[PDB]
Design a protein around this ligand. Structure first.
Ligand SMILES: Cc1ccc(C(N)=O)cn1
Ligand SMILES: O=C(O)CNC(=O)C(=O)O
Ligand code: NI
Ligand SMILES: [Zn+2]
Length: 331
């Protein structure tokens, strides 16, 4: 078996290898990449996402989210307090202000130490889940707005015909902005391109060990667990690498820099944080190997987790028994 220790693999496709997205994902998996839950892909040197990022400042963040933490440094939840709209120009200025800017640090490891030591004592503002794309329309390779849709994958594999669409989202981050432990909706893949700015550090649990993380989460957040059998779907829980190590949870970490892609694989739990002002673009996608994961995916039915329009059809077709109770939570 390839990659039995479930290490995060890093790929360097040539421009020739970068033409066929599906084929390269399949290649990565032939090398065992999916066992880690996360892979890095460094684009060929000839490739560019867009010519320049001039005027990005005009983009509106309609609902910036202030990420307020509760708990202890290594085990906490965050809730999102909605703030007034601001442009990316205003957001960038805020990110770079004395109150919010990245502190002096020696290297990535020093900054990681500072993050887990001090995260809960601050409330950074995240510009998350903004529908849109920053890829040039003339970028033909790995353009996250030009991928085959999940609906077409389901149609090709299963012959089913469903409503729904599948578009990218933009994420504007600053120092300490955080994504909580989660898998994707319906345990889909995700792909994430860091367009510009400071790095993003990722933590990931191998899919074959995801239930170990769930078990620990139920122990660490017992009230949340009683409220919902799938509460990690709420995307509010953080657990530090130190606490994961103390509890024997297998995981890996890696830092993504501007110009790099990350792919998360079905049922690969991940969490992380931003180093400073940056902009990422991400979208969910599917492959034939995903279908079985979609069938098995656990759902939030307490009503907390956000349900996109398109997820309805996935649950309806892949999980018809769950559908009625699940939509009872959506509506
Ligand atoms: C605590 C918890 C959260 C989410 C899930 C899941 N399978 O989605 C399971 N257990
Ligand atoms: O970049 C972020 O803030 C969160 N991204 C993801 O969880 C992802 O790409 O799957
Ligand atoms: Ni994700
Ligand atoms: Zn729930």
């Amino acid at each position: 078996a390839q990659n039995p220790n479930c290490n995060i693999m890093i790929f360097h496709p040539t421009k020739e290898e970068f033409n066929d997205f599906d084929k390269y994902i399949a290649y990565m998996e032939s090398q065992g990449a999916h066992r880690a839950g996360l892979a890095k892909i460094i684009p060929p040197k000839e490739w560019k996402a867009r010519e320049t990022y001039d005027n990005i400042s005009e983009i509106l963040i309609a609902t910036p989210l202030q990420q307020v933490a509760s708990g202890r440094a290594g085990v906490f939840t965050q809730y999102h307090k909605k703030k007034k709209a601001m442009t990316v120009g205003e957001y960038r200025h805020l990110a770079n202000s004395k109150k919010y800017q990245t502190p002096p640090h020696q290297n990535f490891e020093d900054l990681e130490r500072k993050y887990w030591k001090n995260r809960i004592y601050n409330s950074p503002i995240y510009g998350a889940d903004i529908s849109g794309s920053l890829f040039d329309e003339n970028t033909k390779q790995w353009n996250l707005g030009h991928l085959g849709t999940i609906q077409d994958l389901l149609e090709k594999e299963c012959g089913v015909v469903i409503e729904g669409v599948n578009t990218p989202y933009l994420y504007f981050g600053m120092w300490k902005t955080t994504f909580a432990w989660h898998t994707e909706d319906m345990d889909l893949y995700s792909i994430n391109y860091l367009h510009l700015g400071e790095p993003k550090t990722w933590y990931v649990v191998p899919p074959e060990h995801g239930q170990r993380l769930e078990r620990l989460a139920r122990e660490l957040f017992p009230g949340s667990s009683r409220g919902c059998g799938a509460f990690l779907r709420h995307k509010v829980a953080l657990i530090s690498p130190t606490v994961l190590k103390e509890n024997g949870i297998p995981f890996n970490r890696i830092t993504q820099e501007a110009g790099e892609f990350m792919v998360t694989f079905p049922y690969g739990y991940h969490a992380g944080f931003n180093h400073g002002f940056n902009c990422a673009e991400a979208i969910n996608f599917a492959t034939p190997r995903w279908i079985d994961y979609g069938k098995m995916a656990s759902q939030c039915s307490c009503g907390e987790a956000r349900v996109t329009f398109s997820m309805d059809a996935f649950v309806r077709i892949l999980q018809p028994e769950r559908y009625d109770l699940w939509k009872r939570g959506q509506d």
